[PDB]
Amino acid sequence: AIEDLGRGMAAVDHAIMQYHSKMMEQINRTIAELWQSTYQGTDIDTIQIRSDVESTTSSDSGTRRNYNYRVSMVKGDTEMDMRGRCSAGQKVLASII
């Protein structure tokens, strides 16, 4: 009974992780489509939402699952924290999209 409850949680845990990667993927495709279509800004080529799936800390015997989120702006290869700019138009637009 003790080992199989263990593979039971391993399947529950791999399910919440598969779910998390697919949605990141769904949100990234829709947001890229919307931003690339609307070129009003001309300052940022694309924006992504960088959810940190490695933020999860390893407990002595447990997964302790937790994902840390921070939205970033992409200009070519470079990616910036997106926080601290004065382009209120960009801020409101990005929130909306």
Binding site: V12, S51, V71, K91, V92
Partner: peptide
């Protein structure tokens, strides 16, 4: 502008939307 609330508040907000906290409780 909660998409532009700060990282930790931004994180408190996604964890709500995902319906993830309730299945952390079953685990």
């Amino acid at each position: 502008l909660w998409p532009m609330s700060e990282p930790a508040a931004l994180k408190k907000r996604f964890d709500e939307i995902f319906e993830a906290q309730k299945y952390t409780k079953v685990i």
